[PDB]
Amino acid sequence: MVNAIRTPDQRFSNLDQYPFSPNYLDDLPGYPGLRAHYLDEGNSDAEDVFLCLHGEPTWSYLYRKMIPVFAESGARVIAPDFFGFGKSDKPVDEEDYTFEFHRNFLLALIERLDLRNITLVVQDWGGFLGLTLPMADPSRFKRLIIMNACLMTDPVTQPAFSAFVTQPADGFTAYKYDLVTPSDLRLDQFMKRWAPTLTEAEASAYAAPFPDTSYQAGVRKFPKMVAQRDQACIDISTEAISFWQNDWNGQTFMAIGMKDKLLGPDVMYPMKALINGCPEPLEIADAGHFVQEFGEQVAREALKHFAETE
Template sequence: MITALRTPEERFANLPDFDFPVAYVDDLPGYEGLRIARVDAGPVDADRVFLCLHGEPSWSFLYRKMIPVFLESGARVVAPDLLGFGRSDKPAQQSDYSFTFHRNYLIALVERLDLKHVTLVVQDWGGLLGLTLPLAPGFDERIERLIVMNTGIGTGASPGPGFMAWKNYALSTPDLPIGALIARGTPHLTPAEIAAYDAPYPDASYKAGAQVFPALVPVEPDMEGADIGREAAKFWSERWPGKTFMAIGAADPVLGPPAMERLQKLIRGCPEPMVIPDGGHFVQEWGEPIARAAIAAFGGK
């Protein structure tokens, strides 16, 4: 039985530019009793669905500049909050968090909503998890297009010193300054936007996921998730039939141009990326032009 904390709703009052419909589910198979939140906007019967997956330590608020553009195209947008983040419940123990726990949650949610004609939109942990989803039974038919930003596939390869420094800092800092960390590479954030990134966490007890997530990245061959990461790499390089749009925040010191250029070469048919010269790791904060360029590259919808 997982003990989880629930952020009071009043913490999410008056979020800047984030007045989108929110839906909850608390009976996903294997996750009964854990309340999971998602933005779910646009027509339920739309021809296309943009599935927007955030990373760590952010939440679906990160997509607020891209969601309106996707909605303008007539699509449905689903942007879930990972367990431990945003409006979703937050398991209290670091041991509750694992690669498989979160991957299976995303699979269960997509199956519950029966999402089809999906454009997968990923960054950071959204990519580590999301880029493995086509390996779930039937998901290669659900996912038709990809928008990929500042992320990677966890195959067990050794990371650089920048990532290791981040992992060690997160594990040793119980009360992570979430908003300040995101603002460090995103200097144009307003105080209200910084506060919105802090909103899910009334105190340090809510931050177990934010603390432990960097340590869960499959950076050694025998770590959980590395096997399926290697399978996913083969899928994207050998079997991916869909269209891809890549955007790179060039100022990201860990998952910037070198890492993304390697990913571009891996993804079958991936065209030259859109580069945001001053874009940091949380490149969705430059997201409106990225979303518009992606839709144009996909033919206008």
């Protein structure tokens, strides 16, 4: 029912280091006629399940270095693409994209696949949305691996989760400007700017999902949602703080990309205090916003920390 377009499959012909088979879902409750892509790697009947959520403006490709490490530890890996990203259908209207549009999609995915013993792996929007999921069904979640992210609550409740929007000028201000203003937005270039270590092939893999601007409605709406938080988003995110502080009783691992001008130390330490039982954060000096690009390290250390308490 919701007007959407689909990226030609040929756009993903030569993906660098992405040998993962596609899986799709078009029968989701509340999303009729919308096909959703997701990766399901590792033992299908595995007990532990890593749920890797991507942010703005990437896709499951972002976890390409972490998936193998998780799979080889004997776990199942689910890395879905949000509507408007990767190989999932992309609604053409920005107004179709809301906080609950993406959040309800995650809940639908979880129930449809009946995922349990989940180790939530989040970052950026994967965290903004992902961190509000456990409180809706606590029994399905076991662990959490958090990288540069927080909760989209109001400024009074947590000034740290709003301060980065305005300052500094070369932080989120420069980020959002690069995404919502160009007539001809080239994500391969944006990524090389915000992830200086990407190779030419890896950068193009982030542009692959979008042939032209009409495919980028979800990409233009995400940054706007961080700056303009609607009531549902504030109430939901504010209620999540209470979950992480008093109700959370699972293992947690935190990694911070120190060179991140958006969600670095300024945001992560206040986040660590809110998460009950959150241990000392692994600081990755050379890492920026897209911490997953230095993902093999994070994955190994996380499994190490978790394994020690198994």
